[PDB]
Amino acid sequence: MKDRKILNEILSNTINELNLNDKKANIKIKIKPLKWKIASISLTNKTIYINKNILPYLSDEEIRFILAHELLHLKYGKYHINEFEEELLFLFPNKEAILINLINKLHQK
Amino acid sequence: KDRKILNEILSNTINELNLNDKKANIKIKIKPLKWKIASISLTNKTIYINKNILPYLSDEEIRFILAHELLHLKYGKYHINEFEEELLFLFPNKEAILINLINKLHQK
Ligand SMILES: [Cl-]
Ligand SMILES: [Zn+2]
Ligand SMILES: [Zn+2]
DSSP, X not given: OOOHHHHHHHHHHHHHHTTOOTTTTOOEEEEEOOSSOSEEEETTTTEEEXXXXXXXXXXHXXXXXXXXXXXHHXXXXXSOOHHHHHHHHXXXXXXXXXXXXXXXXXXXX | OOHHHHHHXXXXXXXXXXXXXXXXXXXXXXXXXXXXXXXXXXXXXXXXEETTTGGGOOHHHHHHHHHHHHXXXXXXXXXXXXXXXXXXXXXXXXXXXXXXXXXXXXXX
């Protein structure tokens, strides 16, 4: 139902808003069923995999947040440093009070 | 309870969503569904809920899952704008609900 064309548009808009440099900007997105993960990234395949099973629950704004969180790890590394938090709060201002709980709950065991 | 509480939550969500029109036709089945949470057969008015994750669902999580499925009876199989708005009105926190549920199920 949720086509790869809107998904690719959301990814491209989030990369642009985050001003990801040339190599960090070379990322694909693909729909694949996952194992209790909203999203994951294959750093070698240079692909963000969004879970096919939970994709019907996701609004465009929810996808944008999930992709921004993942994309910001490409830019800043594996930790939620101050610059990570600031950039995510700039893209999502009305999420100040829930931001850290959400990003912490997006990491696997 | 457990199966009784699910039936109570289904009946309360149908009423809340104003889908009282042929509530008796709305059925729910517990079946193992791999890594899916739920599905709905619109032609048979049957909701399928994953047996594997059902023990770990809170009343609020069940309510959200069932409301999502029941909204397909009202708007059709596509998540049109009205679907999204209604679900966001009932669950202003639906983004956190889903993220905390997936995290909980992964840990479990
Ligand atoms: Cl089925
Ligand atoms: Zn749906
Ligand atoms: Zn993170």
